[PDB]
Amino acid sequence: FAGGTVSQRCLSCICKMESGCRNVGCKMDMGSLSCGYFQIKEAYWIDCGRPGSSWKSCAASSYCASLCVQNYMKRYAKWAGCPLRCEGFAREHNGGPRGCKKGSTIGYWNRLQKISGCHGVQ
Ligand SMILES: CC(=O)NC1=C[C@H](O[C@@H]2O[C@H](CO)[C@@H](O[C@@H]3O[C@H](CO)[C@@H](O[C@@H]4O[C@H](CO)[C@@H](O)[C@H](O)[C@H]4NC(C)=O)[C@H](O)[C@H]3NC(C)=O)[C@H](O)[C@H]2NC(C)=O)[C@@H](CO)OC1=O
């Protein structure tokens, strides 16, 4: 995946959690479509710098999608006071700018750790 502050093992775990790390297309989630490898919504894609040729094109690319995650965490993680490890990055990915502080994402982190080789992933 793209390089950055998020580890490759963490990105792999998130990728597997969202789509079994496959280009699965989109689905509706609480008002907006989440797409591709990392199930990224348009707003997230905008916030990570509009990488790729378009939102859905980027989402369908493991590299572009992972770069978007890298940029999103560089933008919000430290700002929101998240631990700079997968626990914080995963929750930010699932809950937004301050996702690592939302109780809603506690379940996402716990479910993600159930994936082979993802328990306590950093
Ligand atoms: C069950 C489940 O959770 N499913 C999925 C969750 C997840 O999608 C994530 O969904 C959340 C909430 O809808 C997204 O959070 C929003 O993120 C926005 C983008 O950063 C953010 O909007 C920004 O907000 C800041 C602060 O106000 C502003 O300064 C920015 O200008 C603004 N940007 C824009 C372009 O509007 C917004 O406030 C968040 N909303 C809330 C309620 O927090 C989050 O981004 C989603 N994550 C992704 C990767 O898309 C995914 C994968 O887990 O899809 C799910 O199915």
UniProtKB/Swiss-Prot annotation:
Residues 3-118 form the I-type lysozyme domain. The keyword Disulfide bond applies. The active site is at residues 18, 29. One of its GO terms (molecular function) is chitinase activity. CDD domains: lyz_i. It is found in: Secreted. Optimum pH is 6.5 at 37 degrees Celsius for bacteriolytic activity. Optimum pH is 3 at 40 degrees Celsius for chitinase activity. It catalyses: Hydrolysis of (1->4)-beta-linkages between N-acetylmuramic acid and N-acetyl-D-glucosamine residues in a peptidoglycan and between N-acetyl-D-glucosamine residues in chitodextrins. Has bacteriolytic activity against Gram-positive bacteria M.luteus. Also has chitinase activity. Belongs to the glycosyl hydrolase 22 family. Type-I lysozyme subfamily. This is Lysozyme.
